[PDB]
């Protein structure tokens, strides 16, 4: 068991670097989108 | 009979070439009007050698009522039930019965094959609507009194086959008028009149009149009364006080509305084709009968408009689909 | 597009089988059987016609019936009772003799009231059967009905007792016009028991037909 | 003590980040062909094949890109509530009320084997690998099974009420499951011991999913609220509740980044919740019936969400 703030900062640090690779968060162009 | 443009003056007692309509007895070629002889005449053979606002709004009411029932099935029911394709094809048949009067107004105040296809569309729409009403009554009977047989027999493919056969037989019943018709404008305005070959004018006119009156009144009413007698005999044991009372009332209302909306048309036809009651009059029995024809045909158009209502909107399950569709 | 054409062509063959197999479920009727004090799902599967749920298939008068005995499922009902919605009817089996043992009738009425007033089981009828008809005759002579219910109508006879157990079941049914329920006393004859089932099932099909045809 | 280490909250830290806002979500394509309510589904790693289970007794495999059926599996029991797609793409799990996890081999379709041994209704299935599989049944206890041996290897118990769903970690080493007692327990795959329990809900939990990183996970209960739990702090990280929603939740999943939380409620549609600022980022509507299954592609391309109307829609 560690501090909740250290675990919370780790969770947002994971998605902040992964925000660029999220097609749901950032729309993918229609041509690259298979749908 | 297709529209008011069918009405033409007839030679009741007997230089341009024109043909009279098929709504008057004792036909004769019009020529001022000489009216020498319809056949066996050398001179005739030698010459032949060489409310309107209320009418449109009830149509708009019927159109919005027809396409609404069309789209609601594909959106909600998706034609999984067998009786769905019957009501859907009935709405398309009712469309052909209503989408003719906009072309009738555009045809006048402005050819021959276009008239024949237009009147054929109107006639096949009427016949298909009548046959689809008969088939819907038969489906209701088979579902009420033969529930197990309905479950073991009613298939979508069988309904499709029956609808195709219905369309084919309606087209077959309408082809006599298709072959025995011509534009015959013979004037500044465009007029559209049915014309018989006149070789057996009496017998053929009587045959067509008997055919139309039978298929309009005697077959649908008989099928309806048999199916509804069976439905009532099965439903008197419904054990529900409110649901049973509403269904028998709805059945009686459907029957009386079909009667009061289609029988006067056949009565006017039986009066004006036989001409045994009043045939000596030239215009006194002509203007009144043309007005009666117009009234009965607009009543039939109103009945075709209210058919989707009395066939779908009366159901409680059907009304829930529109509210979800409207959202 | 040779590979793409074969995928759509094979899918069209699949859609053909689902429409044909899906039509089989329309003709066949589904019946749900459940009992609180283990009285349900019994004495109805021993007919001549005949792992988690027991499923029995048989045809009577050109009609295929499907029953599902939910007995091994000891978990909460609210987590899987929504799967049985849309069935033709629900066959509820309650024992007339299950009133003095421990209270058993009160548990049966509670479970019957739970499924009858449930939000999902409102469009499907409920067929209620009275099991142990033979044993209930000699039980009332020794054990009075007043134990289970405070008011036994004072007659204490089988003619009034069988009616009192039947009439009190509709009290739990909150919806009378919205949903219809049946009630029949089971007999020793096997074909007589399914005779009411066929008559009740063929009536619910009529109920669904008028709703589909627009009469209701 | 868990409350001793709870000095701050995630919202007070995430507030500094830029909010996501409204997300343009449109139904690109809908999946038609089923004739009964759909309860569960699973997404493959390649995001090309899709599995769905309906009450019509047919478990057909979908092609997400071209929207057609590549396989048709006639189920023995029509009442099915769970289905899983193995990462190898060879086997497909399927449960139901038979208390049996039937396995069908797509690469031949033929039935591989059926796995019995449970007493409660099967509610969730997940493929740890090509040979191991974990199932969720109604006997208030999970179990680990093997396709090769066909027997129950490891049994995970501890709950008071029956469990309805479970999710797998990205490394297929840990898994959590929810139950009606408002408890989310963490079990080790190899060891088989319950590491910690994540309670705090006030109703029945129906949906549970892992974060892509694996340190946290979210749960879906019936009291119209989602609670996020992290394995590091061993407590409730944040809540996703709204006064507008009063209906229960059936499906909860995560995207690739994990910024947005897709939770399938019982209001005939789906909602999008930001997993950082607890702000709604869109509503996924279009279904005319209750939605019960939802899944996100591993590559994040699209999201399939099927409802009781026998239709599955794709959102990009």
Numbering used by the authors:
A (entry chain C): 27 to 61
B (entry chain R): 1 to 14, 25 to 41, 47 to 65, 128 to 187, 192 to 408
C (entry chain A): 6 to 55, 182 to 233, 241 to 354
D (entry chain B): 21 to 128, 133 to 340
Text lifted from the article:
The chemokine receptor CCR5 plays a vital role in immune surveillance and inflammation. CCR5 exerts its physiological functions by binding to multiple chemokines, such as macrophage inflammatory protein (MIP-1α, also known as CCL3) and RANTES (regulated on activation normal T cell expressed and secreted, also known as CCL5). Here we report three cryo-electron microscopy structures of Gi1 protein-coupled CCR5 in a ligand-free state and in complex with the chemokine MIP-1α or RANTES, as well as the crystal structure of MIP-1α-bound CCR5.
